Enzyme design. Structure first.
Site, mmCIF file in Angstrom:
data_model
loop_
_atom_site.group_PDB
_atom_site.id
_atom_site.type_symbol
_atom_site.label_atom_id
_atom_site.label_comp_id
_atom_site.label_asym_id
_atom_site.label_seq_id
_atom_site.Cartn_x
_atom_site.Cartn_y
_atom_site.Cartn_z
ATOM 1 N N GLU A 124 0.793 -1.133 -0.037
ATOM 2 C CA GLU A 124 -0.089 -0.136 -0.043
ATOM 3 C C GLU A 124 0.957 1.221 0.049
ATOM 4 O O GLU A 124 1.659 1.369 0.886
ATOM 5 C CB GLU A 124 -0.888 -0.145 1.213
ATOM 6 C CG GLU A 124 -1.763 1.205 1.170
ATOM 7 C CD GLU A 124 -2.590 1.387 2.587
ATOM 8 O OE1 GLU A 124 -2.372 0.577 3.495
ATOM 9 O OE2 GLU A 124 -3.610 2.244 2.671
ATOM 10 N N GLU A 176 -8.454 10.666 4.858
ATOM 11 C CA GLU A 176 -8.663 9.426 5.836
ATOM 12 C C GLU A 176 -9.263 10.401 6.958
ATOM 13 O O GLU A 176 -8.634 11.409 7.247
ATOM 14 C CB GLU A 176 -7.426 8.870 6.309
ATOM 15 C CG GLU A 176 -6.617 7.725 5.126
ATOM 16 C CD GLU A 176 -5.674 6.899 5.865
ATOM 17 O OE1 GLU A 176 -4.496 7.562 5.998
ATOM 18 O OE2 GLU A 176 -5.875 5.843 6.096
#
Length: 226
Positions: A123, A206
């Site tokens: 990621e 986020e």
């Protein structure tokens, strides 16, 4: 425009080239985003999050395959060793409250199927802006100059390799950012293998606490093969 409030709500945008997801994966608190269907531009209109040290959601727009859900004619997944150029553009509107980041989330894995996640892969995140003292996972292993700027390199060895590039100074826009430069750096560090596949290029926010008012716009991604 359309307002999406469902936990796993989504809408294909820009003729199906991209897809916007509400993605409230880490909490049960309410969140809504108002999406422009032709561009995929979206504003977080509601975000009741107060999740402590854990991420509550990641409303985002993506190109490629996110957990098996693919956009139209992305040309992905494709092996890293077969990519010659990967570019992206994005414009974000920050707010002065809450705990959140504005970051890309790019997925890699050894296999072509992404339906069950990216275990054993990587990621790669690119943090462009943030607020509230939030920090990337793992630990800072370096600071490097890439694609016209300076970035802190954070790494964590989890079920997949977590690599986060955090800009030394925040920004609100990137135009034709050279994503391959970040990929190449990660490869050189041994965090990503050339044989692995690039599955998706995503960007969003986020959210740990709050987030209403944040806006995502002008998203674009292009991939060129060797």
């Amino acid at each position: 425009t359309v307002e999406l409030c469902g936990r796993w709500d989504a809408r294909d945008v820009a003729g199906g080239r991209y897809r916007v997801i509400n993605n409230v994966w880490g909490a049960e608190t309410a969140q809504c985003i108002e999406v422009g269907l032709e561009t995929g531009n979206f504003t977080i209109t509601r975000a009741d999050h107060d999740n402590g040290n854990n991420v509550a959601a990641y409303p985002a727009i993506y190109f490629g395959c996110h957990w098996g859900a693919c956009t139209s004619n992305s040309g992905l997944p494709r092996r890293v060793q077969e990519l010659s150029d990967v570019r992206t553009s994005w414009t974000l509107t920050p707010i002065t409250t809450g705990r959140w980041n504005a970051a890309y989330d790019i997925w890699f894995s050894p296999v072509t199927n992404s339906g069950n996640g990216y275990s054993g892969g990587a990621e790669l995140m690119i943090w462009l802006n943030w607020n509230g003292g939030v920090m990337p996972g793992g630990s800072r292993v370096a600071t490097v100059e890439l694609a016209g700027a300076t970035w802190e390199v954070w790494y964590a060895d989890w079920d997949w390799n977590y690599i986060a590039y955090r800009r030394t100074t925040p920004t609100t826009s990137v135009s034709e950012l050279d994503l391959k430069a970040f990929i190449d750096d990660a490869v050189a560090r041994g965090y990503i293998r050339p044989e692995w596949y690039l599955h998706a290029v995503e960007t969003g926010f986020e959210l740990w606490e709050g987030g209403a008012g944040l806006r995502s716009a002008d998203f674009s991604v292009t991939v060129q093969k060797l």
